[PDB]
Amino acid sequence: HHLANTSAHDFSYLKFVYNATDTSLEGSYDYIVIGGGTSGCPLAATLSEKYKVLLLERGTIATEYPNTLTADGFAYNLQQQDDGKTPVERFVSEDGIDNVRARILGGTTIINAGVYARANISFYSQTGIEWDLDLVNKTYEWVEDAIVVKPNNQSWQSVIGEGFLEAGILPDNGFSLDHEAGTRLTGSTFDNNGTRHAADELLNKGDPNNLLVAVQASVEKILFSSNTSNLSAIGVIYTDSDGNSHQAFVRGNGEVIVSAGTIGTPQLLLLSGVGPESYLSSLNITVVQPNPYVGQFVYDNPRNFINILPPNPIEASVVTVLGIRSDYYQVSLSSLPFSTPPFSLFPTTSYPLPNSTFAHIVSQVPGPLSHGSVTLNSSSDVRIAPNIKFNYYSNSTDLANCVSGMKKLGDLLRTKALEPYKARDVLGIDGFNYLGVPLPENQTDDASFETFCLDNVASYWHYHGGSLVGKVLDDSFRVMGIKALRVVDASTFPYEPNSHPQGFYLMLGRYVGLQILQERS
Ligand SMILES: Cc1cc2nc3c(=O)[nH]c(=O)nc-3n(C[C@H](O)[C@H](O)[C@H](O)COP(=O)(O)OP(=O)(O)OC[C@H]3O[C@@H](n4cnc5c(N)ncnc54)[C@H](O)[C@@H]3O)c2cc1C
Ligand SMILES: *[C@@H]1O[C@H](CO)[C@@H](O[C@@H]2O[C@H](CO)[C@@H](O)[C@H](O)[C@H]2NC(C)=O)[C@H](O)[C@H]1NC(C)=O
Ligand SMILES: *[C@@H]1O[C@H](CO)[C@@H](O)[C@H](O)[C@H]1NC(C)=O
Ligand SMILES: *[C@@H]1O[C@H](CO)[C@@H](O)[C@H](O)[C@H]1NC(C)=O
Ligand SMILES: *[C@@H]1O[C@H](CO)[C@@H](O)[C@H](O)[C@H]1NC(C)=O
Ligand SMILES: *[C@@H]1O[C@H](CO)[C@@H](O)[C@H](O)[C@H]1NC(C)=O
Ligand SMILES: *[C@@H]1O[C@H](CO)[C@@H](O)[C@H](O)[C@H]1NC(C)=O
Prior knowledge:
It is classed as lyase. By secondary structure, the chain is of the alpha/beta class. The protein has two domains: 330 residues, FAD/NAD(P)-binding domain (3-Layer(bba) Sandwich); 181 residues, Cholesterol Oxidase, domain 2 (2-Layer Sandwich). The protein has ten helices and 26 strands. The two termini are 32 Å apart. The structure holds flavin-adenine dinucleotide, a molecule of 2 linked components (NAG-NAG) and 2-acetamido-2-deoxy-beta-D-glucopyranose (5 copies). One 2-acetamido-2-deoxy-beta-D-glucopyranose binds next to loops.
């Protein structure tokens, strides 16, 4: 009933968006939210219902990059070179796996693949947080009313769904937003006219008299009270696009919330002296609050895949059909050929280029159990990306789950559903033409599947952790030991909420905003 309709991207909120060069944005606020992204935008909009809010985003507005605003533009933004101003910031983990993060108002919802899902209902009790489950669901509906649709039919997504069901990914769940075992059509933040809807549009739910947004605002330090006896965050330093510095503060019972993402939040905490004592001391960063876990327990769920090249063209699609098991989450994207690769779609730049249409058939490892860290490259410059290592497949359970997922992709390639897409009508799956590495020969050779998993891993782009609840934060998302400082974004949990987490983190931004308001009343 509540889902959104086909509609233009709503930029009405630009009336309270300003360049960070404007010094009249400096001053005192009730709340400062750092990072105008997936959690940050609904958080800021929610707080602004009652209080004065400054939202600071390092990127510009999405209208500057029109290919972020359509389903057809997804590949373009990844193909585009990173000049330091583009909405996609490229990086390579220390593992050697290419990756991207967002740099734009709206955050990663402006560049992502649009898949919308609610969290696995078991996630809430898994965390042990005392969730208000009725409020969680009302908050999902608030997001979904604004930016989520039921997708129309797409031929390739329907093929893949028939294949998942035939391969035993049961039951058939029809259309459902919920992360449950089986095959389903889920929601999308692309509407059925191809228009991208995103977290920035949730700013339209803020009070235009109370919410201010500064763009091209690079937040480089959190400021703290000089009296440490009662240590509190008091404000931030940020620089504008011309390089000049600015300061903003919170007042009274207000708070600073960091929503700068898995990469940005631990980086800013470390730069600000919140983190592991001997590490920060080794950089001659004065320790404000020692905590061994800042930038620790950083996770990237592996993506493994094969690419088939059908002998007749298939239609490009956005991902809407999901095949879910407890030990693997599977989808498929169909794509036009390209001569410039979308960066990080494949794990390195030396990957073969497709000359015809292809299906990217994908499996995601849950968890994962392997983890690494975010550490500083520069001890002063927040615009220099931190070092990030994920330690893919260091935990053997992850590898075992990849093996299981790849065997299930073999089952999928053997379905009647996928048979019309073979180049040769032979009995085996070698009748497909493959871009890149095909699935290993014999399913009895687990060592061949393990080698395939290890050598051909890519990022699923769903990385998380680095400021975990229970390590850096309490159950109210407050940074332990520091007053008036919280963290709300994907740095907060060590496991996925589901196969596609934007829906959870959109919800979380508003949910924690409501908790902050209730606490204050
Ligand atoms: C290519 C790609 C595709 C994806 N597709 C999907 C999908 O289809 N479905 C799904 O559910 N999930 C998808 N995801 C994952 C999901 O979108 C992200 O996990 C989620 O959006 C992260 O939200 P966040 O609030 O933690 O971070 P973000 O949304 O990235 O927000 C962080 C914001 O903080 C800003 N920032 C950072 N540092 C600073 C600073 N110092 N000062 C000021 N601002 C700062 C950043 O510019 C950014 O806007 C995808 C991810 C990627 C990379
Ligand atoms: C939803 O999340 C729950 C909780 O994490 C997952 O439950 C686990 O399921 C596996 C396989 O059944 C078990 O080995 C674990 O012991 C379960 N843990 C708990 C705490 O129950 C469940 O797999 C997830 N469901 C899906 C479809 O991903
Ligand atoms: C902010 O102003 C500077 C000039 O002072 C300009 O170069 C930059 O593009 C502006 N940014 C936005 C988002 O308007
Ligand atoms: C919340 O919604 C889910 C479906 O997403 C439903 O299964 C669950 O029962 C709801 N919980 C409450 C407390 O209403
Ligand atoms: C830190 O400062 C001390 C001097 O106080 C110096 O000896 C040491 O080399 C410095 N280390 C770094 C990493 O700057
Ligand atoms: C793999 O992860 C699980 C969960 O954290 C842990 O119990 C196990 O010890 C890990 N294995 C290794 C080798 O670290
Ligand atoms: C900074 O990053 C580059 C490339 O990511 C790396 O080669 C270099 O070693 C890093 N430097 C520090 C001091 O971490």
